[PDB]
Amino acid sequence: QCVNLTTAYTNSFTRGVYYPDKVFRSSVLHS
Amino acid sequence: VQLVESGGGVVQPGRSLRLSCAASGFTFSSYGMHWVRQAPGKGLEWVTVIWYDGSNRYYADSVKGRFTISRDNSKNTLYLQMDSLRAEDTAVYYCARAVAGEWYFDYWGQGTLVTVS
Amino acid sequence: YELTQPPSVSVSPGQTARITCSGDALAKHYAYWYRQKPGQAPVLVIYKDSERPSGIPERFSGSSSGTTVTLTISGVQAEDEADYYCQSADSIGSSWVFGGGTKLTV
Amino acid sequence: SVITPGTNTSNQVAVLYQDVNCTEVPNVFQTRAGCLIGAEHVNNSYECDIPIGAGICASYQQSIIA
Amino acid sequence: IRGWIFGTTLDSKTQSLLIVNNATNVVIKVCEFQFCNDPFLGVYYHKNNKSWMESEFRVYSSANNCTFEYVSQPFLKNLREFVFKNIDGYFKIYSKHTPINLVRDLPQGFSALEPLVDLPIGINITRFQTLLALHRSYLTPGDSSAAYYVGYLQPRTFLLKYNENGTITDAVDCALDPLSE
Ligand SMILES: *[C@@H]1O[C@H](CO)[C@@H](O)[C@H](O)[C@H]1NC(C)=O
Ligand SMILES: *[C@@H]1O[C@H](CO)[C@@H](O)[C@H](O)[C@H]1NC(C)=O
Ligand SMILES: *[C@@H]1O[C@H](CO)[C@@H](O)[C@H](O)[C@H]1NC(C)=O
Ligand SMILES: *[C@@H]1O[C@H](CO)[C@@H](O)[C@H](O)[C@H]1NC(C)=O
Ligand SMILES: *[C@@H]1O[C@H](CO)[C@@H](O)[C@H](O)[C@H]1NC(C)=O
Ligand SMILES: *[C@@H]1O[C@H](CO)[C@@H](O)[C@H](O)[C@H]1NC(C)=O
Ligand SMILES: *[C@@H]1O[C@H](CO)[C@@H](O)[C@H](O)[C@H]1NC(C)=O
Ligand SMILES: *[C@@H]1O[C@H](CO)[C@@H](O)[C@H](O)[C@H]1NC(C)=O
Ligand SMILES: *[C@@H]1O[C@H](CO)[C@@H](O)[C@H](O)[C@H]1NC(C)=O
């Protein structure tokens, strides 16, 4: 069965970044 | 709050009968409504519910596919259309108001007797 | 979501009647009790297991344990000789259920 | 090109659009080097800090000036 | 928030990806689901146990032609972040769990999301919907008786700084402004 229920912005800042791959890197700036 | 049933009568099996419950004393459009039936010598059996805006309606299995519940919020009137009535459907049909925010029935009408034979 | 309650209770005037109702659903959700007199629509007596409406006297109370809920009526009088029902609803709000009904004999 | 003081001092920048008319890009100062946007041009002459070109320099004085 | 629906027409005409979390695990399925317009999971407060418990699913009316099924560990002032990508047949999910002291806005600062699972789904996704757990009391027939944020990804160049432990601690969006550039 189904029920019929249907009857603003924020700043992302510097979030939403994820590890682009599965390679370990350290003490380095990667583009 | 007053609920007044009408449209009850005597019909043969296979025939249709439409009940109507007129509501007054409250904002009808804000409340869900129920029909409950009670056969002579029997207990209370829930039949159907319709939501305040008619968006949802549910039926007891025993009447499912045969009964249709509808409402006109501009006439403050609740309707129950019973098609393909059977002898087993003989009962006093009550309309009742759903309590806001809860699962019980606060206000009841007087009920109207429907006989199928 | 079935509700089971005894067909009748026999109580003498002045005694306390205990009308029970049981079912798995009653361990999850609240029970509601109605009192119906012949020729009249059902009247809510107890809601949320133990609470009264303003039109119901202190002689009525309720309690619950496990899958069983009980309606307790103290100081039973002739006016209490009515059919009492337990009521509940399912977990999705698509179905309402009443018990068979208990006839209380004073 | 981006004109800036060290990020240790300020994150303010000015942008030079080389060979560009200030009218073709979209504190707007037209120089021979190009259109310098974000720097405030002043009459006061100072020792050159960040070279823009054609006698024009920029510095952080706070905001960036030309 | 218990899960998401990812698909196109979101009905039995096409394959859709259904991701749902519950008390013990996460169930991810790909089927021709006939989804509800307002899909949800019911939850109620158990009066004896005095805790919230699952009731019934009202997400779809039917499902068939299932091509994929995967089950793993559960992950749904507590900020939960996810990134959903659908590239070269892989539906890639990244996630992070961070405690916060904010009410209205997302927190400031940098925290990278880690790979959660790479699913070999291979389907077309153009639309999605969030699956919420709705309290039983909201399902009353009367007129009286769940916040989240959505952004979109773009093809951007980022400069990522990896610290001594290989953790990304900062990043530059190269197209944000002339200084970042
Ligand atoms: C939801 O709306 C549809 C379309 O009007 C209707 O067929 C369906 O029965 C409704 N759901 C319920 C529970 O009434
Ligand atoms: C950064 O500015 C501070 C003054 O606030 C100064 O003491 C420090 O030496 C400067 N460092 C560099 C690299 O310019
Ligand atoms: C920019 O264009 C104007 C005409 O709108 C012209 O008069 C001016 O000399 C041009 N400047 C440069 C540096 O080409
Ligand atoms: C520079 O001097 C000119 C007059 O030659 C004047 O019009 C202009 O406003 C002055 N600009 C500043 C920043 O003083
Ligand atoms: C995905 O399905 C939509 C239809 O909802 C279609 O318009 C779109 O082109 C399809 N995309 C791909 C890659 O198949
Ligand atoms: C969670 O989902 C799993 C599916 O494997 C099911 O076996 C389990 O009973 C579910 N638990 C709850 C609380 O829904
Ligand atoms: C109620 O609590 C008991 C522990 O006292 C637990 O064993 C039981 O499973 C709980 N009921 C439900 C439906 O989870
Ligand atoms: C898979 O889809 C085909 C095409 O609609 C259908 O005939 C078939 O019965 C489906 N598989 C199952 C198990 O229903
Ligand atoms: C890196 O790992 C070491 C060892 O666990 C820890 O002591 C150190 O604080 C970590 N540094 C950072 C920046 O996480």
XYZ file of C-alpha atoms in Angstrom, chain E residues 7-181:
175
model
C 16.360 6.079 -10.527
C 14.654 7.784 -13.458
C 10.915 7.263 -13.776
C 10.915 5.710 -10.303
C 8.273 3.160 -11.251
C 8.005 -0.413 -12.509
C 8.955 0.630 -16.047
C 12.679 0.921 -15.290
C 15.310 -0.359 -12.876
C 15.870 1.651 -9.713
C 18.345 1.526 -6.839
C 16.905 1.293 -3.335
C 19.147 1.915 -0.323
C 17.652 1.374 3.131
C 19.206 1.358 6.601
C 17.629 -0.319 9.636
C 18.502 -1.590 13.141
C 20.791 -4.423 12.037
C 21.981 -3.775 8.482
C 21.758 -1.963 5.157
C 19.855 -3.477 2.282
C 20.686 -2.299 -1.210
C 18.617 -3.617 -4.093
C 18.144 -2.990 -7.789
C 14.672 -3.877 -9.081
C 11.807 -2.535 -11.147
C 10.207 -0.979 -8.089
C 6.771 0.564 -8.238
C 7.473 3.356 -5.793
C 4.901 5.345 -3.821
C 4.589 9.092 -4.398
C 5.454 9.651 -0.737
C 7.615 6.609 0.132
C 8.448 6.123 3.792
C 9.175 3.741 6.640
C 6.741 3.620 9.542
C 8.030 3.871 13.105
C 6.134 3.727 16.404
C 6.859 4.215 20.078
C 6.535 0.907 21.914
C 4.720 1.728 25.140
C 6.101 -1.160 27.194
C 9.691 -1.145 25.865
C 9.562 2.696 25.857
C 11.502 2.938 22.614
C 10.982 3.493 18.901
C 10.497 0.401 16.740
C 9.933 -0.428 13.085
C 6.463 -1.162 11.744
C 5.900 -1.528 8.007
C 7.400 -0.340 4.740
C 5.407 2.015 2.555
C 8.119 2.684 0.008
C 6.855 0.671 -2.951
C 3.758 -1.342 -3.817
C 5.640 -4.029 -5.731
C 9.067 -5.076 -6.971
C 10.304 -7.520 -9.598
C 13.108 -8.191 -12.130
C 15.765 -7.775 -9.409
C 19.324 -7.741 -10.744
C 21.374 -6.756 -7.701
C 21.321 -7.239 -3.942
C 23.879 -6.248 -1.318
C 23.810 -6.276 2.476
C 26.283 -4.613 4.837
C 26.721 -2.656 8.075
C 24.373 0.221 9.131
C 25.413 3.858 8.720
C 22.214 5.922 9.298
C 23.881 17.448 16.995
C 25.022 14.570 14.730
C 26.043 15.394 11.177
C 25.937 12.664 8.567
C 27.329 13.472 5.136
C 27.177 11.484 1.920
C 28.295 11.853 -1.672
C 26.557 9.934 -4.433
C 28.228 9.403 -7.800
C 27.240 7.233 -10.755
C 30.267 6.768 -13.005
C 31.176 3.983 -15.429
C 28.547 1.685 -13.959
C 29.682 2.217 -10.376
C 27.401 3.845 -7.860
C 29.942 5.253 -5.465
C 29.035 6.293 -1.962
C 31.301 8.349 0.283
C 30.458 9.220 3.871
C 31.461 10.933 7.108
C 30.072 11.018 10.654
C 30.852 14.161 12.658
C 29.421 15.538 15.968
C 28.352 19.176 15.718
C 27.153 22.112 17.810
C 25.049 23.773 15.101
C 21.290 23.923 14.590
C 20.537 25.824 11.376
C 23.654 25.794 9.194
C 26.272 23.247 8.213
C 29.571 23.576 10.174
C 32.599 25.470 8.929
C 35.994 23.835 8.483
C 37.308 20.930 6.447
C 36.610 17.213 6.737
C 36.974 14.766 3.856
C 34.488 11.960 3.236
C 35.800 8.418 2.869
C 34.661 5.728 0.390
C 31.866 3.656 1.892
C 31.047 1.257 -0.922
C 31.550 0.899 -4.674
C 28.434 -0.752 -6.042
C 28.461 -2.492 -9.483
C 24.943 -1.269 -10.212
C 25.103 -0.265 -13.886
C 21.841 1.731 -14.086
C 20.601 5.119 -15.346
C 19.895 7.645 -12.536
C 18.409 11.097 -13.106
C 16.274 11.621 -10.002
C 16.304 10.611 -6.355
C 14.172 10.786 -3.220
C 14.948 10.645 0.499
C 13.390 7.897 2.615
C 12.237 9.095 6.017
C 10.925 7.311 9.088
C 7.581 8.835 9.987
C 6.169 8.676 13.477
C 2.949 6.697 13.752
C 1.179 9.729 15.225
C 1.539 11.513 11.883
C -0.612 8.895 10.195
C -3.796 9.864 12.011
C -6.712 10.870 9.700
C -6.956 14.355 11.249
C -5.178 17.488 10.004
C -2.865 17.772 13.006
C -0.436 15.824 15.225
C 13.202 15.580 9.292
C 15.630 18.179 7.866
C 18.383 17.602 5.315
C 20.616 19.435 2.857
C 21.104 18.728 -0.847
C 23.847 20.061 -3.102
C 25.143 19.039 -6.510
C 28.574 18.090 -7.774
C 30.427 19.848 -10.582
C 33.558 19.102 -12.669
C 36.066 21.181 -10.738
C 39.784 21.165 -10.080
C 40.748 20.813 -6.437
C 44.072 21.087 -4.682
C 44.039 18.617 -1.807
C 46.460 18.730 1.103
C 47.406 15.378 2.610
C 48.933 15.505 6.092
C 51.575 13.160 7.519
C 48.937 10.435 8.170
C 47.498 10.705 4.624
C 44.418 12.579 5.763
C 43.056 15.399 3.663
C 42.952 18.354 6.035
C 42.389 21.199 3.607
C 41.459 21.899 0.007
C 41.310 24.674 -2.567
C 38.504 25.069 -5.083
C 40.534 26.361 -8.036
C 37.492 28.050 -9.580
C 36.180 29.779 -6.447
C 38.025 33.089 -6.804
C 41.302 34.613 -8.222
C 43.226 33.797 -5.046
C 42.241 30.151 -5.012
C 43.210 30.065 -8.671
